[PDB]
RNA sequence: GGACGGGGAACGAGCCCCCGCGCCCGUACCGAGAACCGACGCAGGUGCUCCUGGGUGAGAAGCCCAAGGCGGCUCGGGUGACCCCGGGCCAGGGAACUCGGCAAAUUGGCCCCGUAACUUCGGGAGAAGGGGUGCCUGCGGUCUUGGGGUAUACCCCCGGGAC
RNA sequence: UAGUAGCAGCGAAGAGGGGUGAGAAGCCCCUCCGCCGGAAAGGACCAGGGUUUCCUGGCAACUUCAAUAGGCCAGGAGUUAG
RNA sequence: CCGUGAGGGAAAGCUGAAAAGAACCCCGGAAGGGGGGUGAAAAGAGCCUGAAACCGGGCGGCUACAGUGGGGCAGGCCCGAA
RNA sequence: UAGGCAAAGCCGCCCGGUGGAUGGCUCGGCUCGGGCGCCGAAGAAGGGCGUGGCAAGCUGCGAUAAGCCCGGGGUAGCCGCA
């Protein structure tokens, strides 16, 4: 009978990881049942070596460096990384929620809100800082927007 | 492709099964009669004078 | 209807551990017929009947008896043990 | 096949039952004249047309 | 319980491994060590037993790149068999 | 399943508790570079039919490594001639080879600049052509995701993520 | 012919020690080395095959070499459903 | 047994009167070998007789300066019991 | 000069291994002559499956399964091929 098959089934690991001590080579031939394999496992002549997990210290170090901004230059890019459509969705949602909050709180007349909304949809503003700077410079609100 | 490569497609299909009346591997499952004894299409046994 | 008893290692373990008898019966016998036959012939109460058809073409039945009758005791009584 | 019909299963059971060489006592009884059986076969070599 | 009857230190040169096919260099090195020990201890190549550290040293860089030389200790036992160990 | 109608009894549930019955057939294993077909323990075909972790990466690509499995595409050793099959390099010349640039070689990703004749006005187009590309130390920006601040957007602080 | 061809090519492969055994490079165990890892390779499973499954024992024949190994041979067993 | 199927389809007889089927001893891992037995005869279960092709050994002739097979004549070596 | 004297190889005989001819044998075939001549819903022929203590095939039989009952013949052996 194959001892390693029963041992792997008992221990719930791979047969590749089941290890049989050479001191039980005599007792292997007398192994008949899974109870016998359990007895050998209890004695400690049969055990499961630990599985290998890929170490992540190198990855964590490289991830810290990438967060700081290394190893992402022109010579390290092979395909598209920035999503234009997702960027447009986020840009519209940021500007629209800001303008709608201003109109809801009453700082902007609905007509001025309409003009700003159409300019945002028409891509007049690069970013929220540009939108705020335009609002402050053209004085579309009674108090300045931070 | 008509030889050995096409021979590999004869591994899962079937034209005939065992006939209940004559016991040969000659019952056509799609035509629903036996190609040997004619069961399912003729109540009389199929046997021709040109066959020894 | 009963052809014989199965006295293999699996059948003996099932008899000692689960109160089950293993019999070889006619291939056309149903679970109802097997249960009634067991009850009539041996005067025990049948809890349930599991049936299968072996690869050699025979019907084998695992008859689990009620909780007042011993499968091992019945086997010893018939002397097929 | 995993899913079988009973008639095909019974024919396979008949082939399984018949597939066996003659017993040694039969060989001794016939004085080494009956050694083989026509129903002896190997599953990989000779195929039943079940 | 096996007693040592002789002990020597040897430096076995394995430069011949670079003259054979790259797909068998470590196994060829094992054969070279066995032949060297048999020649220098006057025994048959099957009476020589390689040690585990020596085997791992020979196989440390996989089948293609065995080390160029090994410093070993050879011991002749009272039954006539010989043991070879990597010196350490 | 519901609704809309007709008929009947004095009982009575789609709610709660409790009782009883559920027959027959399949069920092992392979599921394929050895369990199927191909005369074979066959580099083919059927079935890669459906599913699959980490790094790099545009990627279900390749390369390396998990989980898991394998060393059984079922000969081993020595030698290091020629010759053959497959692969690497080769000064100066650069198609003079040859039916013929066959074969091989060149180019190659991404970003920026730039892009002709012609055209069915859509295209041609990655036309062509040029430049950049590693690692390290810092400074920023655009968002995202939670929590805390008067605080639902903005603003400040804190933790994570992307570019 | 001839103890000759083939047992290469299709991107993996073996080594050390021990045990068993008449007999071991090859079977069993440990250690080292390697290959796959969206797969000629890990999980599931259809048709088809039909006992090849599991256990025990074995090597007259089979496996492109060997064998104490085996999908092989002999004996025994195994498939449970509202 | 072959073909999906209609269909197609082999090879393969003989111990001895009687198992009297080979006791027993030595060797071999085993198939088995030697010795020793049974039988009128091994006719030994691979079983009446047992041809030739083929292969092994013994014997006779030749055999490395001489081009092959068949016939006639002369000779050398060998057999020449019936 | 030739013999002692021989490589590989060639021819002939003998013995052995292989092979299964030959001869002998025959419960088989073939031809011819004579007879006899329908079975099935009272479920036939044919097929599948099963059936023996050890039983794989053939033969027989059919869950009463190499088989059960009755009568006649046949007497002492019998449990088919085996
Ligand atoms: Mg890099
Ligand atoms: Mg767009
Ligand atoms: Mg065609
Ligand atoms: Mg069809
Ligand atoms: Mg069932
Ligand atoms: Mg096949
Ligand atoms: Mg299963
Ligand atoms: Mg193969
Ligand atoms: Mg990949
Ligand atoms: Mg693993
Ligand atoms: Mg190998
Ligand atoms: Mg070789
Ligand atoms: Mg050059
Ligand atoms: Mg020219
Ligand atoms: Mg020229
Ligand atoms: Mg070209
Ligand atoms: Mg050779
Ligand atoms: Mg060769
Ligand atoms: Mg690789
Ligand atoms: Mg790898
Ligand atoms: Mg797979
Ligand atoms: Mg197996
Ligand atoms: Mg086994
Ligand atoms: Mg078998
Ligand atoms: Mg003879
Ligand atoms: Mg005379
Ligand atoms: Mg000679
Ligand atoms: Mg009939
Ligand atoms: Zn038919």
Q: What is the DSSP string of B1-44?
A: -TTHHHHGGGGS--SEE--TTT-SS-EETTTTEETTT-TTT-SS
CB contact under 8 A, C55 and D12: yes
DSSP string of A70-105? Answer: -S-SGGG--S--S-HHHHHHHHHHHHHHHHHHHHHH
Q: What is the rounded distance in angstroms from the CA atom of residue E55 to the CA atom of residue E61? A: 11
Which positions on strand F lie below 7 Å from a protein C-beta?
Answer: 22-32, 35-39, 41-42, 44-46, 53-59, 65-70, 77-80, 109-111, 132-144, 152-155, 161-163
Contact C80, C41 (CB under 8 A): no
Report which of A83, A144, A88 is spatially closest to residue A96, judged by C-alpha positions. A88
C6 vs C74: CA distance, rounded Å: 13
Continuous segment of H or E residues that includes residue A118? helix A110-121
Report which bound ligand comes closest to the CA of B29: 4
Resolution for this experimental structure (Å): 2.4
User: In the PDB record, what is the listed experimental method?
Assistant: cryo-EM
Dist. CA A69 → ligand 28 center (Å): 92
* D chain contacts of residue C57, beta-carbon cutoff 8 Å: 9-10, 13-14, 17
From the CA of A3, how many Å to the C1' of F121? 79
Cβ atoms A120, A100 nearer than 8 A = no
Which chain I nucleotides are covered by protein, judged by CB under 7 A? 45-51, 54-57, 63, 82
Minimal C-alpha gap between C53 and chain D (Å): 9
Report the C-alpha gap between A18 and A10 in whole angstroms. 10
Collapsing DSSP to helix, strand or coil, C55 comes out as coil
How far, in Å, is the centroid of ligand 7 from the Cα of A16? 23
CA of B9 to C1' of F9 (A): 70
Instruction: Give me the residues of C, 42-71, that contact D with CB < 8 A.
Output: 53-57
Enter the DSSP assignment of C30. -
| Nearest residue to E21 via CA among E74, E64, E83, E73 | E64
* CA dist., res. A24 & res. A29, Å (int): 9
Three-state SS for E23-54 is: HHHHHHHHHHHHHHHHHHHCCCHHHEEECHHH
Contacts of C16 (CB under 8 A, 6+ apart): C71, C72
In this structure, the number of other CB atoms found within 10 A of the CB of residue A44 comes to: 10
Mutate to test the interface with C, among D6, D13, D20 (most CBs of C within 10 A): D13
Chain D residues within 8 Å of chain B (Cβ atoms):
7, 11, 49-50
Q: Where are the beta strands (DSSP E) in A1-146?
A: 18-20, 46-48
Decide if D24 touches C, using CB distance below 8 A: no
Which nucleotides of strand G are protein-proximal, with an atom < 7 A from a CB? 13-19, 28-34, 45-52, 54-56, 71-81
Instruction: Please measure the distance between the N-terminal and C-terminal CA atoms of chain C and give it in whole angstroms.
Output: 20
Q: Are D and B close enough to touch, i.e. 3+ CB pairs under 8 angstroms?
A: yes
Q: Are C49 and C7 in contact (CB under 8 A)?
A: no
CA E28 vs. chain centroid, Å, equals 11
How far apart are the C-alpha atoms of A83 and E2, rounded to whole Å?
74
Q: Nearest CA to C51 among C60, C42, C38? A: C60
Distance D1 CA to ligand 8 centre (A): 25
How far apart CA E31 and CA E84 sit, in angstroms, is: 13
Strands (E), chain C: 2-5, 20-25, 46-53, 59-65
């Amino acid at each position: 009978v194959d001892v390693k098959r029963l041992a792997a089934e008992i221990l719930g690991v791979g047969v590749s990881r089941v290890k049989i001590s050479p001191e039980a080579v005599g007792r292997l031939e007398e192994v008949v049942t899974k109870d016998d394999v359990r007895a050998l496992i209890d004695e400690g002549l049969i055990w499961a070596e630990p599985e290998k997990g890929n170490s992540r210290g190198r990855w964590r170090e490289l991830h810290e460096k990438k967060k700081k901004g290394r190893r992402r230059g022109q010579g390290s890019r092979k395909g598209r990384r920035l999503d234009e459509e997702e960027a447009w969705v986020n840009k519209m949602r940021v500007m629209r929620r800001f303008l709608n909050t201003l109109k809801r709180q009453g700082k902007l007349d609905p007509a001025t809100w309409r003009q700003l909304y159409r300019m945002v949809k028409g891509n007049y503003f690069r970013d929220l800082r540009h939108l705020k700077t335009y609002i402050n410079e053209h004085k579309l609100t009674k108090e300045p927007v931070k | 492709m008509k030889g050995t490569p096409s021979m590999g497609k004869h591994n899962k299909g079937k034209t005939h099964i065992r006939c209940p009346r004559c016991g040969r591997h000659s019952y056509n499952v799609t035509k629903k009669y036996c190609a040997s004894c004619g069961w399912g299409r003729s109540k009389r046994w199929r046997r021709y004078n040109w066959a020894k | 209807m009963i052809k014989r008893f199965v006295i293999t290692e699996k059948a003996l373990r099932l008899a000692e551990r689960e109160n089950k008898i293993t019999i070889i019966v006619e291939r056309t016998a149903t679970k109802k017929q097997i249960a009634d036959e067991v009850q009539r012939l041996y005067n025990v109460k049948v809890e349930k009947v599991n049936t299968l058809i072996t690869p050699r073409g025979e019907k084998k039945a695992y008859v689990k008896l009620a909780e007042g009758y011993s499968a091992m005791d019945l086997l010893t009584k018939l002397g097929v043990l | 096949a995993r899913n079988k019909p009973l008639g095909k299963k019974l024919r396979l059971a008949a082939a399984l039952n018949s597939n066996r060489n003659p017993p040694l006592w039969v060989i001794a009884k016939t004085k080494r004249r009956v050694t083989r059986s026509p129903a002896r076969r190997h599953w990989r070599r000779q195929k039943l047309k079940a | 319980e096996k007693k040592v009857v002789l002990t020597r230190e040897y430096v076995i040169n394995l430069r011949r491994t670079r003259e054979v096919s790259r797909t068998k260099r470590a196994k060829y090195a094992v054969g070279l060590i066995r032949r060297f020990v048999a020649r220098h201890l006057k025994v048959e190549p099957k009476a020589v037993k390689l040690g585990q550290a020596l085997n791992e040293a020979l196989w440390a860089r996989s089948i293609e790149k065995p080390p160029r030389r090994v410093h070993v200790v050879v011991e002749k036992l009272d039954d006539g068999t010989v043991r070879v160990e990597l010196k350490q």
